[PDB]
Amino acid sequence: ASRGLAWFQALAGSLAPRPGDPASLRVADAELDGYPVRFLAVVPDPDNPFPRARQGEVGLLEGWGLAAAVDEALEADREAPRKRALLAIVDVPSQAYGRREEALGIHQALAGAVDAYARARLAGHPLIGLLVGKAMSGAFLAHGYQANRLIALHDPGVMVHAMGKAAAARITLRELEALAAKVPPMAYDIDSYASLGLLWRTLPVETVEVPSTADLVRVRTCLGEALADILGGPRDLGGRREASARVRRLLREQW
Amino acid sequence: ARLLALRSFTELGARQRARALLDAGSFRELLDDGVVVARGLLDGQPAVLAAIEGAFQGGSLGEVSGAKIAGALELAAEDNRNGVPTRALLLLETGGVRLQEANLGLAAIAEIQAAIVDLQRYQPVVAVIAGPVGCFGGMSIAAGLCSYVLVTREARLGLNGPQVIEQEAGIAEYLTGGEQRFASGLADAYLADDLDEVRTSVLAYFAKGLPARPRCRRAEDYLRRLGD
């Protein structure tokens, strides 16, 4: 159905959604290097109650569903000596586009997801975002972009951007791949994104669509090292671009 | 001075809005790009204000404008951890990110969102959406994180703009105005387009403090209601 589903199954061990979750959500608890983790993936649901969210989009149920699943873990580990890691497997084409979505406050639903992920991170849950496919726009903000560490597969299908290539073409009246290729923050490819300093690591894989055994081993290893790298350390976003740095220095001087 | 043209809030540019809302004589602009970041007082209380100029690039955010907002929110959180109750006020007139800096703009939005959640362990962030641009894109998700969202009749708030909806979902299927948002509980107050009224509402909401059960904490309830 999608790369996100393929990698969820490979890493977590199961394929079917949990009883209480939307079918567009895969959630599973497991262990990594003896450390408690929860895998989360948004995946396509052709039977989504919302017609505009039947191709893997982060819509109303996905936003609030993520919030609920993350808050569930946060509340359960409130007293635990070990806060479980949240491993976001990211392959999301876009947010849902629709009039019912807007009327019912899809911006608020996605805010719910962001708030839960951020609160979990601030509370000491290690968050790792694993980009195995598309990581687009508001869907990525809601599912992945609050991570302590971002890891991407080094593959042409892995793309981070704020809008679809089709949408960008329309606004620049266009061919756009060509134009975007010379401007790194505008480019869709993962090498360009990596040059921004926003990834902790990139990982090549043999069969990106269904990981090989060696792939699974390499990715599990890398996730393990990300987890080790986070624990006990500062709880800021991974990204934490000289212009940005200058801005923050000037603000502090002038505050 | 008693007439609408002299009392209007939406008629003001971003910098004028910022000066009008902060206590008289306290307005101090930092990094004097399309975003105004200003320090000042709100009813005697330490404050920072970030206002996006929607008349410039449609208020599209880039690396610098994005970092100005994120950094202002980050320093306000730092203040609070140092015992200084700094309040952040966001004037959100924006339609998304600049295509030419697209991924830097998006990353900055994630940092803005993170900083809002961090700051709201200490102080409510108030977001004011007055129009005429309104608030669309990744920054509408930021609005959804804020403790209080105040809108005017001319305000629109949503994730996707009209054009991208029609191009993706069609001319029709078989919504985003301030009044609608207030009626459906997605905005906390519906304000007259009046400077004194906007300023007083902002101050009342800061004085109210952190909400006990904000919309972001109601996922199970929204899920039930959608299930209906």
Numbering used by the authors:
A (entry chain A): 6 to 179, 183 to 248, 254 to 268
B (entry chain B): 5 to 36, 57 to 198, 209 to 262
Cite, word for word, the article reporting this structure.
We determined the crystal structure of the P. aeruginosa MdcD–MdcE complex at 1.86 Å resolution by the selenomethionyl single-wavelength anomalous diffraction method. The two copies of the MdcD–MdcE complex in the asymmetric unit have essentially the same conformation, with overall rms distance of 0.4 Å between their equivalent Cα atoms. The structures of the MdcD and MdcE subunits have the crotonase fold, with a β–β–α motif that is repeated four times in its core (β–β–α superhelix). The two subunits are related by a rotation of 173° in this complex, suggesting pseudo two-fold symmetry between them. The A. calcoaceticus MdcD–MdcE complex was reported to be a 2:2 hetero-tetramer in solution, and the MdcD subunit itself could also dimerize. In contrast, the P. aeruginosa MdcD–MdcE complex is a 1:1 hetero-dimer in solution based on our gel filtration data, and a 2:2 hetero-tetramer was not observed in the crystal either. The structural overlay with the S. aureus CT indicates that the C-terminal helices (α8A and α8B) of MdcD clash with the second copy of the S. aureus CT and therefore the MdcD–MdcE complex is incompatible with the CT hetero-tetramer, which may explain why Pseudomonas MdcD–MdcE is a 1:1 complex. In fact, this helix and the following residues are mostly disordered in the malonate complex and MdcD–MdcE alone.
